């Protein structure tokens, strides 16, 4: 009996922040500086074609004078995120087929907000979710954090089949990145130090269902992929790379130039180490060649595709949906995967794939973060 | 074949932040307000003989002028608390007798640090744990956050055996809340809202080791107790109840007063769900009884103790273990309920006759109660 993904929906923020848009909103606000001008020369680089924000442009975000206080931060994403969530997280259940009452598992996570309690808690109200709901809010993994809440849910819901009760587990994923724009771009004016995270970007929510099969009902998908097997790696001297710092007015991104070169070293042995923990696969030597699967990488930046693409052998085509949630989206954090996801599901309704699919995402440690799904 | 607890030990920072010392650090920094004198008075009746700090008496923490920023108290959590948090999971896993090597799974927890990575991250380099473990950070939950760990390890560990492979998790709860007593103390003076938080909290790292008991190895300790079922409960029209906010500073924490009448509300409703939803003990009527359980209730304050103690039927002496832990070391938030489970241990091998069954019982913030039910192996 597997763990099966049986709905899948994301929604990103309503209003899109451009090159234009957001060279109105830096202009705005701080006349230009080396670096001020070298972010913006960047940010037209990225081959993102579109990101989303919570906040229109007309939004007081954009316009107060002031930077948005920590306490302002915690109530803007209460405000416009957890909505995101709600309506994300309807969908897929939606998409499911299955009732409310029957969400064993909450997995939630998100990397752009603290609070007690969490979102999580705000979101089994809104959802009509049973008091007795399991939830886990996941912290401190980043754009790791859709594959890694995979990992949670997919283990919990093995929990229950060795005690042979029904499991449904809901995953979501909850970003407002946005929320931190005004903080980081008062940072970069102050410091002069490029802040590449102000190109990379956006705002959205994402959720899925998994199912450990048991007790099913006609109203519920069948399995759309079946969860085999999941693989965390941490790499050794990598902490001084990706941060995502606290600070008085938010949190503060550190985003090292050498992340890509760092993507095409340990992709392919991340790869390597998930196949050897995978019984089934371990053993045949053909398993172990990347272009014999189907390809889901989560999109940190555009050098980072290309350098994954490249270690792993894969050409662009194989990473088409990653590249397109990438160009219409922009880096998502945790929800990013499972947009691959849902565009990857579109595609095969609609004519299409490879029998097994792997799933791989850095977050913050430095850790890389796999799954090898397979088509039922 | 039972998931157990097979590893136990906890770590209380080092200092004693007694009544006098919390008086000399309030008076030091801020002049007599009504607000000042009346928490100073609460302070003293606590019921809590010592509660630690990381901060010694003479630590700059205590005497700077200024209220120290967010990244200031994100680097002492990372300069104080994961040493107490290494030194904490280092002790359980010497308890347990395996290598660190053999751990599977990191299930982590905290609600005085937010950090990318997390506190977990450092801690697998420290413990030199397997470059392929699997991590889990928990967050949101505050106090209930101890046994919410263990019901995701319980649960995580479940699904090894439903692989038939071997699984060790670690556990590690880490609290540093005087980190924010500077920042408390401020807003309660500006605001003149008295923050009985400054009185209840303290600092202290907390581990458990737990094994699905595959693979056993003869260097592992036999199972301590056996973990029977967890069960989570999130109470309707509770959000108002208990909030640590984020601001400029840290967090604050907002402590209503209707905390210990909720608190026996709660509990028998959340004792019979935990009963009922353990097929084997569902059945039968003395099972709903909890005079026929041992019992561990986190001590999120003195009033909170009582409160559940007469709601179900206790004894003070029931919960002596509780109240002990409250009265050294005060409300360390997620840590404490695994002191009390030490304590437990401790008196068992020194010759406690103690009930076969042992529920545990925790309100974190939703309002959540968190509770786990454990057998004598």
Redesign the interface.
């Known amino acids: 009996q597997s763990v099966s993904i049986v709905g899948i929906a994301s929604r990103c923020a309503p209003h899109k922040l451009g090159a234009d848009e957001l060279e109105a909103i830096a202009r705005r606000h701080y006349s230009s500086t080396p670096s001020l001008e070298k972010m913006l020369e960047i940010n037209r680089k990225t081959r993102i074609d579109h990101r989303y924000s919570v906040f229109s442009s007309d939004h007081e975000h954009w316009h107060r004078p002031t930077i948005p ?3 302002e931060c ?1 109530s803007l994403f209460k405000e416009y995120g957890i909505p995101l969530a709600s309506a994300a997280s309807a969908r897929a259940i939606q998409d499911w087929g299955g009732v409310p009452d029957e969400i064993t598992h909450l997995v939630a996570v998100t ?1 752009t907000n ?8 705000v979101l ?1 109200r809104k959802l009509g979710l049973k ?12 754009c790791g954090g859709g594959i890694s809440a995979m ?2 849910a ?10 042979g009760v029904p499991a449904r587990a809901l995953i979501v994923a909850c970003e407002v990145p946005t929320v931190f724009a005004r903080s980081e771009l008062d940072i970069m004016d102050k410091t002069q130090d490029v802040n590449v995270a102000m190109c990379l970007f956006g705002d959205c929510a994402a959720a899925l269902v998994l199912s450990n099969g048991i007790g099913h009902k006609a109203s519920e998908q069948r399995p759309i992929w079946n969860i085999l097997n999941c ?6 001297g990598t ?1 001084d790379i ?8 938010g ?1 503060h991104a550190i985003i090292d130039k050498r992340i890509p070169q760092l993507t095409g070293k340990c992709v392919p042995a991340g790869f390597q ?1 998930l196949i050897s ?1 995978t019984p089934s696969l371990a053993l045949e030597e053909k398993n172990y060649v990347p272009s014999n699967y189907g390809w889901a990488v989560h999109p940190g930046g555009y050098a980072v595709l290309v350098a994954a693409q490249d270690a792993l052998g894969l050409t662009a085509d194989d990473l088409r949906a990653s590249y397109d949630a990438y160009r219409d989206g922009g880096n998502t954090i945790s929800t990013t995967i499972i947009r691959i996801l849902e565009k990857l599901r579109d595609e095969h309704k609609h004519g299409s794939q490879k029998d097994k699919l792997v799933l791989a995402a850095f ?5 890389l973060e796999t799954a090898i799904l397979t088509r039922p």
Do not use: M, W
């Not at 603290?114 to 808690?121: C, E, L, Q, R, W």
């Not at 997919?154 to 005690?163: F, K, R, V």
């Not at 693989?231 to 050794?236: A, G, L, R, V």
């Open positions: 206080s920590f306490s915690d990397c603290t609070a007690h309690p969490g979102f999580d808690s089994c008091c007795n709901v399991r939830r886990v809010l996941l912290h401190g993994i980043g990992r949670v997919h283990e919990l819901l093995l929990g229950s089949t060795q005690q693989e965390p790696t941490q790499f050794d902490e990706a941060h995502f710092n606290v600070h008085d007015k949190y180490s923990s977050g913050h440690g430095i850790t």
